[PDB]
Structure formats: C-alpha cells, structure tokens
JSON list of C-alpha atoms and ligand atoms in Angstrom, two decimals:
[
{"chain": "A", "resi": 14, "resn": "UNK", "atom": "CA", "xyz": [-7.17, 5.49, -18.49]},
{"chain": "A", "resi": 15, "resn": "UNK", "atom": "CA", "xyz": [-9.94, 6.78, -16.70]},
{"chain": "A", "resi": 16, "resn": "UNK", "atom": "CA", "xyz": [-10.53, 5.14, -13.23]},
{"chain": "A", "resi": 17, "resn": "UNK", "atom": "CA", "xyz": [-13.56, 2.12, -14.20]},
{"chain": "A", "resi": 18, "resn": "UNK", "atom": "CA", "xyz": [-10.68, 1.80, -18.07]},
{"chain": "A", "resi": 19, "resn": "UNK", "atom": "CA", "xyz": [-8.32, 1.77, -15.07]},
{"chain": "A", "resi": 20, "resn": "UNK", "atom": "CA", "xyz": [-9.89, -0.75, -12.95]},
{"chain": "A", "resi": 21, "resn": "UNK", "atom": "CA", "xyz": [-10.94, -3.12, -15.93]},
{"chain": "A", "resi": 22, "resn": "UNK", "atom": "CA", "xyz": [-8.32, -2.78, -18.14]},
{"chain": "A", "resi": 23, "resn": "UNK", "atom": "CA", "xyz": [-5.32, -2.42, -16.26]},
{"chain": "A", "resi": 24, "resn": "UNK", "atom": "CA", "xyz": [-4.97, -3.15, -12.87]},
{"chain": "A", "resi": 25, "resn": "UNK", "atom": "CA", "xyz": [-7.59, -6.65, -12.98]},
{"chain": "A", "resi": 26, "resn": "UNK", "atom": "CA", "xyz": [-5.38, -8.05, -15.55]},
{"chain": "A", "resi": 27, "resn": "UNK", "atom": "CA", "xyz": [-2.18, -7.47, -13.93]},
{"chain": "A", "resi": 28, "resn": "UNK", "atom": "CA", "xyz": [-3.32, -8.59, -10.74]},
{"chain": "A", "resi": 29, "resn": "UNK", "atom": "CA", "xyz": [-4.56, -11.57, -11.96]},
{"chain": "A", "resi": 30, "resn": "UNK", "atom": "CA", "xyz": [-1.65, -12.27, -14.23]},
{"chain": "A", "resi": 31, "resn": "UNK", "atom": "CA", "xyz": [1.49, -10.65, -11.99]},
{"chain": "A", "resi": 32, "resn": "UNK", "atom": "CA", "xyz": [-0.43, -10.28, -8.37]},
{"chain": "A", "resi": 33, "resn": "UNK", "atom": "CA", "xyz": [1.86, -6.90, -8.21]},
{"chain": "A", "resi": 34, "resn": "UNK", "atom": "CA", "xyz": [0.48, -3.77, -10.10]},
{"chain": "A", "resi": 35, "resn": "UNK", "atom": "CA", "xyz": [1.94, -0.44, -10.34]},
{"chain": "A", "resi": 36, "resn": "UNK", "atom": "CA", "xyz": [-0.23, 3.06, -11.12]},
{"chain": "A", "resi": 37, "resn": "UNK", "atom": "CA", "xyz": [2.15, 6.29, -11.73]},
{"chain": "A", "resi": 38, "resn": "UNK", "atom": "CA", "xyz": [0.23, 9.66, -11.31]},
{"chain": "A", "resi": 39, "resn": "UNK", "atom": "CA", "xyz": [-2.50, 8.70, -9.28]},
{"chain": "A", "resi": 40, "resn": "UNK", "atom": "CA", "xyz": [-3.62, 12.21, -8.26]},
{"chain": "A", "resi": 41, "resn": "UNK", "atom": "CA", "xyz": [-1.54, 14.48, -10.13]},
{"chain": "A", "resi": 42, "resn": "UNK", "atom": "CA", "xyz": [0.75, 16.93, -8.86]},
{"chain": "A", "resi": 43, "resn": "UNK", "atom": "CA", "xyz": [-1.76, 19.42, -6.77]},
{"chain": "A", "resi": 44, "resn": "UNK", "atom": "CA", "xyz": [-3.01, 16.32, -5.22]},
{"chain": "A", "resi": 45, "resn": "UNK", "atom": "CA", "xyz": [0.28, 14.30, -4.57]},
{"chain": "A", "resi": 46, "resn": "UNK", "atom": "CA", "xyz": [2.04, 17.71, -3.04]},
{"chain": "A", "resi": 47, "resn": "UNK", "atom": "CA", "xyz": [-0.82, 18.51, -0.70]},
{"chain": "A", "resi": 48, "resn": "UNK", "atom": "CA", "xyz": [-1.03, 15.49, 0.69]},
{"chain": "A", "resi": 49, "resn": "UNK", "atom": "CA", "xyz": [3.67, 15.13, 0.70]},
{"chain": "A", "resi": 50, "resn": "UNK", "atom": "CA", "xyz": [2.77, 18.56, 2.97]},
{"chain": "A", "resi": 51, "resn": "UNK", "atom": "CA", "xyz": [-0.10, 17.08, 5.03]},
{"chain": "A", "resi": 52, "resn": "UNK", "atom": "CA", "xyz": [2.34, 13.97, 6.28]},
{"chain": "A", "resi": 53, "resn": "UNK", "atom": "CA", "xyz": [5.62, 16.07, 7.15]},
{"chain": "A", "resi": 54, "resn": "UNK", "atom": "CA", "xyz": [3.47, 18.38, 9.38]},
{"chain": "A", "resi": 55, "resn": "UNK", "atom": "CA", "xyz": [1.94, 15.38, 11.15]},
{"chain": "A", "resi": 56, "resn": "UNK", "atom": "CA", "xyz": [3.55, 15.35, 15.30]},
{"chain": "A", "resi": 79, "resn": "UNK", "atom": "CA", "xyz": [13.20, 5.70, 14.66]},
{"chain": "A", "resi": 80, "resn": "UNK", "atom": "CA", "xyz": [10.46, 5.16, 11.95]},
{"chain": "A", "resi": 81, "resn": "UNK", "atom": "CA", "xyz": [7.39, 7.41, 12.52]},
{"chain": "A", "resi": 82, "resn": "UNK", "atom": "CA", "xyz": [4.29, 5.69, 12.20]},
{"chain": "A", "resi": 83, "resn": "UNK", "atom": "CA", "xyz": [0.71, 7.08, 12.86]},
{"chain": "A", "resi": 84, "resn": "UNK", "atom": "CA", "xyz": [-2.83, 5.57, 11.85]},
{"chain": "A", "resi": 85, "resn": "UNK", "atom": "CA", "xyz": [-5.12, 8.08, 10.01]},
{"chain": "A", "resi": 86, "resn": "UNK", "atom": "CA", "xyz": [-8.86, 7.53, 9.39]},
{"chain": "A", "resi": 87, "resn": "UNK", "atom": "CA", "xyz": [-9.02, 10.75, 7.29]},
{"chain": "A", "resi": 88, "resn": "UNK", "atom": "CA", "xyz": [-10.92, 13.21, 8.92]},
{"chain": "A", "resi": 89, "resn": "UNK", "atom": "CA", "xyz": [-8.60, 14.98, 11.50]},
{"chain": "A", "resi": 90, "resn": "UNK", "atom": "CA", "xyz": [-7.28, 18.25, 11.65]},
{"chain": "A", "resi": 91, "resn": "UNK", "atom": "CA", "xyz": [-4.36, 18.74, 8.36]},
{"chain": "A", "resi": 92, "resn": "UNK", "atom": "CA", "xyz": [-5.01, 15.98, 7.39]},
{"chain": "A", "resi": 93, "resn": "UNK", "atom": "CA", "xyz": [-8.28, 15.91, 5.11]},
{"chain": "A", "resi": 94, "resn": "UNK", "atom": "CA", "xyz": [-6.39, 15.41, 1.43]},
{"chain": "A", "resi": 95, "resn": "UNK", "atom": "CA", "xyz": [-5.08, 12.32, 2.47]},
{"chain": "A", "resi": 96, "resn": "UNK", "atom": "CA", "xyz": [-8.60, 11.11, 3.32]},
{"chain": "A", "resi": 97, "resn": "UNK", "atom": "CA", "xyz": [-8.92, 12.12, -0.73]},
{"chain": "A", "resi": 98, "resn": "UNK", "atom": "CA", "xyz": [-6.37, 9.61, -1.11]},
{"chain": "A", "resi": 99, "resn": "UNK", "atom": "CA", "xyz": [-8.26, 7.14, 0.94]},
{"chain": "A", "resi": 100, "resn": "UNK", "atom": "CA", "xyz": [-11.80, 7.60, -0.80]},
{"chain": "A", "resi": 101, "resn": "UNK", "atom": "CA", "xyz": [-9.64, 7.68, -4.61]},
{"chain": "A", "resi": 102, "resn": "UNK", "atom": "CA", "xyz": [-8.38, 4.19, -3.92]},
{"chain": "A", "resi": 103, "resn": "UNK", "atom": "CA", "xyz": [-10.81, 2.90, -2.48]},
{"chain": "A", "resi": 104, "resn": "UNK", "atom": "CA", "xyz": [-12.84, 4.19, -5.50]},
{"chain": "A", "resi": 105, "resn": "UNK", "atom": "CA", "xyz": [-11.06, 2.35, -7.35]},
{"chain": "A", "resi": 106, "resn": "UNK", "atom": "CA", "xyz": [-10.88, -0.79, -5.50]},
{"chain": "A", "resi": 107, "resn": "UNK", "atom": "CA", "xyz": [-15.23, -0.16, -6.32]},
{"chain": "A", "resi": 108, "resn": "UNK", "atom": "CA", "xyz": [-15.14, -0.20, -9.54]},
{"chain": "A", "resi": 109, "resn": "UNK", "atom": "CA", "xyz": [-12.69, -3.70, -10.20]},
{"chain": "A", "resi": 110, "resn": "UNK", "atom": "CA", "xyz": [-16.45, -5.12, -9.56]},
{"chain": "A", "resi": 111, "resn": "UNK", "atom": "CA", "xyz": [-14.79, -8.29, -7.50]},
{"chain": "A", "resi": 112, "resn": "UNK", "atom": "CA", "xyz": [-12.67, -9.30, -10.46]},
{"chain": "A", "resi": 113, "resn": "UNK", "atom": "CA", "xyz": [-8.97, -9.26, -8.66]},
{"chain": "A", "resi": 114, "resn": "UNK", "atom": "CA", "xyz": [-9.25, -12.50, -7.12]},
{"chain": "A", "resi": 115, "resn": "UNK", "atom": "CA", "xyz": [-11.38, -14.68, -6.21]},
{"chain": "A", "resi": 116, "resn": "UNK", "atom": "CA", "xyz": [-12.21, -11.46, -3.54]},
{"chain": "A", "resi": 117, "resn": "UNK", "atom": "CA", "xyz": [-15.79, -10.20, -1.85]},
{"chain": "A", "resi": 118, "resn": "UNK", "atom": "CA", "xyz": [-14.26, -6.75, -1.07]},
{"chain": "A", "resi": 119, "resn": "UNK", "atom": "CA", "xyz": [-15.80, -4.60, 1.74]},
{"chain": "A", "resi": 120, "resn": "UNK", "atom": "CA", "xyz": [-13.92, -2.40, 3.31]},
{"chain": "A", "resi": 121, "resn": "UNK", "atom": "CA", "xyz": [-10.55, -1.97, 4.33]},
{"chain": "A", "resi": 122, "resn": "UNK", "atom": "CA", "xyz": [-7.78, -0.68, 7.53]},
{"chain": "A", "resi": 123, "resn": "UNK", "atom": "CA", "xyz": [-7.05, 2.95, 8.29]},
{"chain": "A", "resi": 124, "resn": "UNK", "atom": "CA", "xyz": [-4.17, 4.22, 6.47]},
{"chain": "A", "resi": 125, "resn": "UNK", "atom": "CA", "xyz": [-0.41, 4.00, 8.22]},
{"chain": "A", "resi": 126, "resn": "UNK", "atom": "CA", "xyz": [1.11, 6.76, 7.31]},
{"chain": "A", "resi": 127, "resn": "UNK", "atom": "CA", "xyz": [5.28, 6.45, 7.50]},
{"chain": "A", "resi": 128, "resn": "UNK", "atom": "CA", "xyz": [7.61, 8.46, 8.10]},
{"chain": "A", "resi": 129, "resn": "UNK", "atom": "CA", "xyz": [10.69, 6.65, 7.69]},
{"chain": "A", "resi": 130, "resn": "UNK", "atom": "CA", "xyz": [14.35, 7.92, 8.77]},
{"chain": "A", "resi": 131, "resn": "UNK", "atom": "CA", "xyz": [17.40, 8.03, 5.87]},
{"chain": "A", "resi": 132, "resn": "UNK", "atom": "CA", "xyz": [19.50, 6.52, 9.32]},
{"chain": "A", "resi": 133, "resn": "UNK", "atom": "CA", "xyz": [20.18, 3.20, 7.81]},
{"chain": "A", "resi": 134, "resn": "UNK", "atom": "CA", "xyz": [18.12, 0.65, 9.06]},
{"chain": "A", "resi": 135, "resn": "UNK", "atom": "CA", "xyz": [16.13, -1.39, 6.59]},
{"chain": "A", "resi": 136, "resn": "UNK", "atom": "CA", "xyz": [12.95, -4.29, 7.07]},
{"chain": "A", "resi": 137, "resn": "UNK", "atom": "CA", "xyz": [13.65, -7.94, 6.70]},
{"chain": "A", "resi": 138, "resn": "UNK", "atom": "CA", "xyz": [12.49, -9.41, 3.96]},
{"chain": "A", "resi": 139, "resn": "UNK", "atom": "CA", "xyz": [8.67, -10.77, 5.26]},
{"chain": "A", "resi": 140, "resn": "UNK", "atom": "CA", "xyz": [5.16, -11.06, 3.96]},
{"chain": "A", "resi": 141, "resn": "UNK", "atom": "CA", "xyz": [1.89, -9.21, 5.65]},
{"chain": "A", "resi": 142, "resn": "UNK", "atom": "CA", "xyz": [-0.61, -11.27, 5.86]},
{"chain": "A", "resi": 143, "resn": "UNK", "atom": "CA", "xyz": [0.37, -14.58, 6.34]},
{"chain": "A", "resi": 144, "resn": "UNK", "atom": "CA", "xyz": [-1.99, -16.39, 8.77]},
{"chain": "A", "resi": 145, "resn": "UNK", "atom": "CA", "xyz": [-5.64, -15.29, 7.84]},
{"chain": "A", "resi": 146, "resn": "UNK", "atom": "CA", "xyz": [-6.02, -11.91, 9.25]},
{"chain": "A", "resi": 147, "resn": "UNK", "atom": "CA", "xyz": [-8.30, -10.55, 6.23]},
{"chain": "A", "resi": 148, "resn": "UNK", "atom": "CA", "xyz": [-6.51, -8.59, 4.40]},
{"chain": "A", "resi": 149, "resn": "UNK", "atom": "CA", "xyz": [-6.14, -9.74, 1.00]},
{"chain": "A", "resi": 150, "resn": "UNK", "atom": "CA", "xyz": [-4.73, -6.74, -0.83]},
{"chain": "A", "resi": 151, "resn": "UNK", "atom": "CA", "xyz": [-1.49, -3.49, -0.22]},
{"chain": "A", "resi": 152, "resn": "UNK", "atom": "CA", "xyz": [-1.87, -0.37, -1.94]},
{"chain": "A", "resi": 153, "resn": "UNK", "atom": "CA", "xyz": [1.14, 1.25, -1.34]},
{"chain": "A", "resi": 154, "resn": "UNK", "atom": "CA", "xyz": [1.10, 5.61, -2.48]},
{"chain": "A", "resi": 155, "resn": "UNK", "atom": "CA", "xyz": [4.46, 7.07, -2.35]},
{"chain": "A", "resi": 156, "resn": "UNK", "atom": "CA", "xyz": [5.30, 10.65, -2.06]},
{"chain": "A", "resi": 157, "resn": "UNK", "atom": "CA", "xyz": [9.11, 11.15, -2.85]},
{"chain": "A", "resi": 158, "resn": "UNK", "atom": "CA", "xyz": [10.08, 13.74, -5.49]},
{"chain": "A", "resi": 159, "resn": "UNK", "atom": "CA", "xyz": [13.08, 13.55, -7.40]},
{"chain": "A", "resi": 160, "resn": "UNK", "atom": "CA", "xyz": [13.48, 9.94, -4.97]},
{"chain": "A", "resi": 161, "resn": "UNK", "atom": "CA", "xyz": [16.81, 8.56, -6.82]},
{"chain": "A", "resi": 162, "resn": "UNK", "atom": "CA", "xyz": [17.15, 4.68, -5.74]},
{"chain": "A", "resi": 163, "resn": "UNK", "atom": "CA", "xyz": [21.09, 4.91, -6.49]},
{"chain": "A", "resi": 164, "resn": "UNK", "atom": "CA", "xyz": [21.28, 8.08, -4.62]},
{"chain": "A", "resi": 165, "resn": "UNK", "atom": "CA", "xyz": [19.15, 7.60, -1.89]},
{"chain": "A", "resi": 166, "resn": "UNK", "atom": "CA", "xyz": [17.57, 3.48, -1.42]},
{"chain": "A", "resi": 167, "resn": "UNK", "atom": "CA", "xyz": [14.61, 2.53, 0.32]},
{"chain": "A", "resi": 168, "resn": "UNK", "atom": "CA", "xyz": [13.69, 0.33, -2.91]},
{"chain": "A", "resi": 169, "resn": "UNK", "atom": "CA", "xyz": [10.80, -1.81, -2.30]},
{"chain": "A", "resi": 170, "resn": "UNK", "atom": "CA", "xyz": [12.60, -6.15, -3.23]},
{"chain": "A", "resi": 171, "resn": "UNK", "atom": "CA", "xyz": [9.42, -7.68, -3.80]},
{"chain": "A", "resi": 172, "resn": "UNK", "atom": "CA", "xyz": [9.99, -12.08, -4.45]},
{"chain": "A", "resi": 173, "resn": "UNK", "atom": "CA", "xyz": [6.86, -13.01, -5.96]},
{"chain": "A", "resi": 174, "resn": "UNK", "atom": "CA", "xyz": [5.70, -16.60, -4.73]},
{"chain": "A", "resi": 175, "resn": "UNK", "atom": "CA", "xyz": [7.80, -19.47, -7.35]},
{"chain": "A", "resi": 176, "resn": "UNK", "atom": "CA", "xyz": [8.70, -16.71, -9.82]},
{"chain": "A", "resi": 177, "resn": "UNK", "atom": "CA", "xyz": [12.87, -16.84, -10.74]},
{"chain": "A", "resi": 178, "resn": "UNK", "atom": "CA", "xyz": [12.50, -13.45, -11.14]},
{"chain": "A", "resi": 179, "resn": "UNK", "atom": "CA", "xyz": [11.94, -10.26, -8.67]},
{"chain": "A", "resi": 180, "resn": "UNK", "atom": "CA", "xyz": [10.89, -6.66, -9.24]},
{"chain": "A", "resi": 181, "resn": "UNK", "atom": "CA", "xyz": [12.69, -3.51, -7.34]},
{"chain": "A", "resi": 182, "resn": "UNK", "atom": "CA", "xyz": [10.00, -0.72, -7.52]},
{"chain": "A", "resi": 183, "resn": "UNK", "atom": "CA", "xyz": [11.35, 2.66, -6.70]},
{"chain": "A", "resi": 184, "resn": "UNK", "atom": "CA", "xyz": [9.74, 4.77, -4.02]},
{"chain": "A", "resi": 185, "resn": "UNK", "atom": "CA", "xyz": [8.26, 7.61, -6.24]},
{"chain": "A", "resi": 186, "resn": "UNK", "atom": "CA", "xyz": [5.72, 11.12, -6.46]},
{"chain": "A", "resi": 187, "resn": "UNK", "atom": "CA", "xyz": [1.98, 10.35, -6.91]},
{"chain": "A", "resi": 188, "resn": "UNK", "atom": "CA", "xyz": [2.90, 6.18, -7.70]},
{"chain": "A", "resi": 189, "resn": "UNK", "atom": "CA", "xyz": [-0.23, 3.71, -6.15]},
{"chain": "A", "resi": 190, "resn": "UNK", "atom": "CA", "xyz": [1.27, 0.26, -5.67]},
{"chain": "A", "resi": 191, "resn": "UNK", "atom": "CA", "xyz": [-0.15, -2.70, -4.96]},
{"chain": "A", "resi": 192, "resn": "UNK", "atom": "CA", "xyz": [-0.37, -6.67, -4.49]},
{"chain": "A", "resi": 193, "resn": "UNK", "atom": "CA", "xyz": [-1.82, -9.08, -3.04]},
{"chain": "A", "resi": 194, "resn": "UNK", "atom": "CA", "xyz": [-0.76, -9.09, 0.74]},
{"chain": "A", "resi": 195, "resn": "UNK", "atom": "CA", "xyz": [-0.19, -13.07, 1.21]},
{"chain": "A", "resi": 196, "resn": "UNK", "atom": "CA", "xyz": [2.81, -15.68, 0.80]},
{"chain": "A", "resi": 197, "resn": "UNK", "atom": "CA", "xyz": [2.77, -14.47, -2.62]},
{"chain": "A", "resi": 198, "resn": "UNK", "atom": "CA", "xyz": [4.33, -11.65, -2.28]},
{"chain": "A", "resi": 199, "resn": "UNK", "atom": "CA", "xyz": [7.63, -12.00, 0.47]},
{"chain": "A", "resi": 200, "resn": "UNK", "atom": "CA", "xyz": [8.82, -8.75, 0.63]},
{"chain": "A", "resi": 201, "resn": "UNK", "atom": "CA", "xyz": [11.76, -6.69, 2.01]},
{"chain": "A", "resi": 202, "resn": "UNK", "atom": "CA", "xyz": [12.37, -2.69, 2.29]},
{"chain": "A", "resi": 203, "resn": "UNK", "atom": "CA", "xyz": [16.78, -1.49, 1.34]},
{"chain": "A", "resi": 204, "resn": "UNK", "atom": "CA", "xyz": [17.73, 0.96, 4.12]},
{"chain": "A", "resi": 205, "resn": "UNK", "atom": "CA", "xyz": [18.15, 4.90, 3.26]},
{"chain": "A", "resi": 206, "resn": "UNK", "atom": "CA", "xyz": [20.27, 7.86, 3.65]},
{"chain": "A", "resi": 207, "resn": "UNK", "atom": "CA", "xyz": [17.45, 10.54, 2.51]},
{"chain": "A", "resi": 208, "resn": "UNK", "atom": "CA", "xyz": [13.88, 10.69, 4.96]},
{"chain": "A", "resi": 209, "resn": "UNK", "atom": "CA", "xyz": [10.86, 8.66, 2.98]},
{"chain": "A", "resi": 210, "resn": "UNK", "atom": "CA", "xyz": [7.24, 9.42, 2.74]},
{"chain": "A", "resi": 211, "resn": "UNK", "atom": "CA", "xyz": [4.46, 6.97, 1.83]},
{"chain": "A", "resi": 212, "resn": "UNK", "atom": "CA", "xyz": [1.23, 5.62, 3.11]},
{"chain": "A", "resi": 213, "resn": "UNK", "atom": "CA", "xyz": [-0.46, 1.87, 3.37]},
{"chain": "A", "resi": 214, "resn": "UNK", "atom": "CA", "xyz": [-3.89, 0.94, 3.32]},
{"chain": "A", "resi": 215, "resn": "UNK", "atom": "CA", "xyz": [-5.12, -2.76, 3.34]},
{"chain": "A", "resi": 216, "resn": "UNK", "atom": "CA", "xyz": [-8.47, -3.48, 1.57]},
{"chain": "A", "resi": 217, "resn": "UNK", "atom": "CA", "xyz": [-10.52, -6.51, 2.60]},
{"chain": "A", "resi": 218, "resn": "UNK", "atom": "CA", "xyz": [-11.96, -10.07, 2.24]},
{"chain": "A", "resi": 219, "resn": "UNK", "atom": "CA", "xyz": [-14.96, -10.78, 3.67]},
{"chain": "A", "resi": 220, "resn": "UNK", "atom": "CA", "xyz": [-15.16, -13.97, 3.82]},
{"chain": "A", "resi": 221, "resn": "UNK", "atom": "CA", "xyz": [-11.44, -14.29, 5.05]},
{"chain": "A", "resi": 222, "resn": "UNK", "atom": "CA", "xyz": [-11.97, -11.19, 8.28]},
{"chain": "A", "resi": 223, "resn": "UNK", "atom": "CA", "xyz": [-15.99, -12.73, 8.90]},
{"chain": "A", "resi": 224, "resn": "UNK", "atom": "CA", "xyz": [-13.79, -16.07, 10.21]},
{"chain": "A", "resi": 225, "resn": "UNK", "atom": "CA", "xyz": [-10.82, -14.13, 11.71]},
{"chain": "A", "resi": 226, "resn": "UNK", "atom": "CA", "xyz": [-14.11, -12.07, 13.81]},
{"chain": "A", "resi": 227, "resn": "UNK", "atom": "CA", "xyz": [-15.70, -15.88, 15.27]},
{"chain": "A", "resi": 228, "resn": "UNK", "atom": "CA", "xyz": [-11.89, -16.18, 16.89]},
{"chain": "A", "resi": 229, "resn": "UNK", "atom": "CA", "xyz": [-13.16, -13.58, 19.76]},
{"chain": "A", "resi": 230, "resn": "UNK", "atom": "CA", "xyz": [-15.59, -11.09, 21.75]},
{"chain": "A", "resi": 231, "resn": "UNK", "atom": "CA", "xyz": [-16.14, -7.54, 21.08]},
{"chain": "A", "resi": 232, "resn": "UNK", "atom": "CA", "xyz": [-14.10, -4.71, 21.98]},
{"chain": "A", "resi": 233, "resn": "UNK", "atom": "CA", "xyz": [-11.14, -7.57, 23.00]},
{"chain": "B", "resi": 301, "resn": "LIG", "atom": "C1", "xyz": [7.65, -0.82, 6.80]},
{"chain": "B", "resi": 301, "resn": "LIG", "atom": "C2", "xyz": [6.91, -2.06, 5.43]},
{"chain": "B", "resi": 301, "resn": "LIG", "atom": "C3", "xyz": [7.56, -0.73, 4.24]},
{"chain": "B", "resi": 301, "resn": "LIG", "atom": "C4", "xyz": [7.06, -2.09, 3.78]},
{"chain": "B", "resi": 301, "resn": "LIG", "atom": "C5", "xyz": [6.80, -3.01, 3.26]},
{"chain": "B", "resi": 301, "resn": "LIG", "atom": "N1", "xyz": [6.38, -3.56, 3.51]},
{"chain": "B", "resi": 301, "resn": "LIG", "atom": "C6", "xyz": [6.71, -2.96, 5.46]},
{"chain": "B", "resi": 301, "resn": "LIG", "atom": "C7", "xyz": [6.54, -3.76, 6.78]},
{"chain": "B", "resi": 301, "resn": "LIG", "atom": "N2", "xyz": [4.59, -4.01, 6.27]},
{"chain": "B", "resi": 301, "resn": "LIG", "atom": "C8", "xyz": [3.63, -3.74, 6.39]},
{"chain": "B", "resi": 301, "resn": "LIG", "atom": "C9", "xyz": [3.83, -2.73, 7.73]},
{"chain": "B", "resi": 301, "resn": "LIG", "atom": "C10", "xyz": [3.04, -3.58, 8.45]},
{"chain": "B", "resi": 301, "resn": "LIG", "atom": "C11", "xyz": [3.87, -4.69, 8.80]},
{"chain": "B", "resi": 301, "resn": "LIG", "atom": "C12", "xyz": [4.68, -5.57, 7.66]},
{"chain": "B", "resi": 301, "resn": "LIG", "atom": "C13", "xyz": [2.02, -4.20, 8.26]},
{"chain": "B", "resi": 301, "resn": "LIG", "atom": "O1", "xyz": [1.65, -4.90, 7.10]},
{"chain": "B", "resi": 301, "resn": "LIG", "atom": "N3", "xyz": [1.20, -3.82, 9.95]},
{"chain": "B", "resi": 301, "resn": "LIG", "atom": "C14", "xyz": [-0.25, -4.41, 9.37]},
{"chain": "B", "resi": 301, "resn": "LIG", "atom": "C15", "xyz": [-0.72, -5.35, 10.74]},
{"chain": "B", "resi": 301, "resn": "LIG", "atom": "C16", "xyz": [-2.23, -5.70, 10.68]},
{"chain": "B", "resi": 301, "resn": "LIG", "atom": "C17", "xyz": [-2.80, -5.23, 10.40]},
{"chain": "B", "resi": 301, "resn": "LIG", "atom": "C18", "xyz": [-4.52, -5.47, 10.23]},
{"chain": "B", "resi": 301, "resn": "LIG", "atom": "C19", "xyz": [-5.59, -4.76, 10.80]},
{"chain": "B", "resi": 301, "resn": "LIG", "atom": "C20", "xyz": [-6.58, -4.78, 11.09]},
{"chain": "B", "resi": 301, "resn": "LIG", "atom": "C21", "xyz": [-7.05, -6.39, 10.62]},
{"chain": "B", "resi": 301, "resn": "LIG", "atom": "C22", "xyz": [-6.28, -7.12, 11.00]},
{"chain": "B", "resi": 301, "resn": "LIG", "atom": "C23", "xyz": [-4.53, -7.19, 10.96]},
{"chain": "B", "resi": 301, "resn": "LIG", "atom": "C24", "xyz": [-3.01, -4.08, 9.22]},
{"chain": "B", "resi": 301, "resn": "LIG", "atom": "C25", "xyz": [-1.50, -3.32, 9.14]},
{"chain": "B", "resi": 301, "resn": "LIG", "atom": "C26", "xyz": [1.87, -3.28, 10.70]},
{"chain": "B", "resi": 301, "resn": "LIG", "atom": "O2", "xyz": [1.02, -2.61, 11.39]},
{"chain": "B", "resi": 301, "resn": "LIG", "atom": "N4", "xyz": [3.09, -3.20, 9.56]},
{"chain": "B", "resi": 301, "resn": "LIG", "atom": "C27", "xyz": [4.10, -2.09, 10.03]},
{"chain": "B", "resi": 301, "resn": "LIG", "atom": "N5", "xyz": [5.48, -1.84, 9.67]},
{"chain": "B", "resi": 301, "resn": "LIG", "atom": "C28", "xyz": [6.43, -1.30, 9.56]},
{"chain": "B", "resi": 301, "resn": "LIG", "atom": "C29", "xyz": [5.87, -0.61, 10.83]},
{"chain": "B", "resi": 301, "resn": "LIG", "atom": "C30", "xyz": [5.22, -1.10, 12.64]},
{"chain": "B", "resi": 301, "resn": "LIG", "atom": "N6", "xyz": [4.42, -2.23, 11.85]},
{"chain": "B", "resi": 302, "resn": "LIG", "atom": "MN1", "xyz": [5.08, -5.01, 4.23]}
]
C-alpha cells in the first residue's frame, strides 16, 4: 500500500478500532539494514536520544522523517488528536540478560504524548528462543497481544491508559527505536504548568 492509502485505509481504521497497528516491511530491507548498522555503531540497557542529524545517524533520521510523513497522511483522523510534533528518538540496545519491563502505561497523566511508534531491527528474531516479546493489554478487552520485535516492523499504539504493556526478558541483544507523537491541545496544557528552560 502507498503511504496515503496505507495511512487512510489501514492505519487510521486500525488505530480507531483496536488502538494497536502493525505495519510490516515498513522501509524495506536495504533501509532497515542501514538503520541496524547505525544503531549498532552507537557508542544493562543502553538508551540514546537521537535527533537524526548526528554523525552516523542519517538513516535513523530518514526513519524519523518517514514516520512523520505517515502520520501527516493520517490527516487528523487518528482519534480526536491534532498531531503537531513528536519527541526525539529513543534508540535502545537491550542486552539479553534476562531482565524485563513491568506492566506500565507510557503516558498515564497527560504529558502530551498520544501515539507510541516503535521500529524494530531484529533479523530472524525467534521469540521462543530469544524472548523479548512486547505484551499489550488493550483496556477492557478479553484478549491481549504479543508483538514479535521483527526486523523492519513499525508498531503504533495509543500511549495513554488504553495500552498497558510489559516486555518479556530476552536472551539475545534487542534493538528498537521509539518516537512519541504529541497532541497539540494536551501538549499546550502541559506547558502552562512551568516556565521556559525548567
Ligand atoms: C523499555 C520499553 C520497551 C517497550 C515498551 N515500553 C518500554 C518503556 N516505555 C517506553 C520508554 C519510556 C518508559 C516506557 C518512556 O515512555 N519514556 C519517555 C518519557 C517521557 C517522554 C516525554 C518527552 C517529551 C515530553 C513529554 C514526555 C518520552 C519518553 C522513557 O524515557 N522511557 C524509558 N524506558 C526505559 C528506560 C528509560 N526510559
Ligand atoms: Mn512502554
């Protein structure tokens, strides 16, 4: 599906109906492999915050710009949100050391973030061997979903209490990149609570 059709015919209806949406083969093999190389070159869990213009991060920047265009093509149809910006990218290297993340909500208290977008980099990742599954518990539903951290897979989900999630421990190093998109009204309300530079 082309980006306009992908947004309007798949991401929008899927987010509105389920609050979670998986796009496989988002950028293609060549672009995905370049992003994987850049992330491995960056120098317990290791988190680095990336704007996209740093040396050796050009293809990470391309991923970010591509996620931005896809969101733009949703034409304000994602929930009631007016999306006008996003965070930097959280580039994460998770060692396979048998630690996980307890069930949590990314934005439980109105900090501005409305959509979590995760891009995965793990080729031939077997969850039954290496672990690292993301388990999402959509609010009020009888079912939950385990998401495999597949190479070139883009995951969207609402960042608020609709999607508590936990991360299973892993036995091989996992790499993922996350951005969060802001709702204009929520982000404006968050900014009345303090002063510049604080
Ligand atoms: C690790 C993981 C894997 C899969 C799914 N979820 C998670 C965890 N969640 C995802 C990552 C998590 C915790 C929740 C998270 O949202 N923000 C975060 C917090 C605040 C803003 C912000 C930015 C601008 C304005 C307002 C707010 C942006 C991001 C972290 O800094 N985070 C984090 N996480 C681990 C180590 C350090 N920091
Ligand atoms: Mn999370």
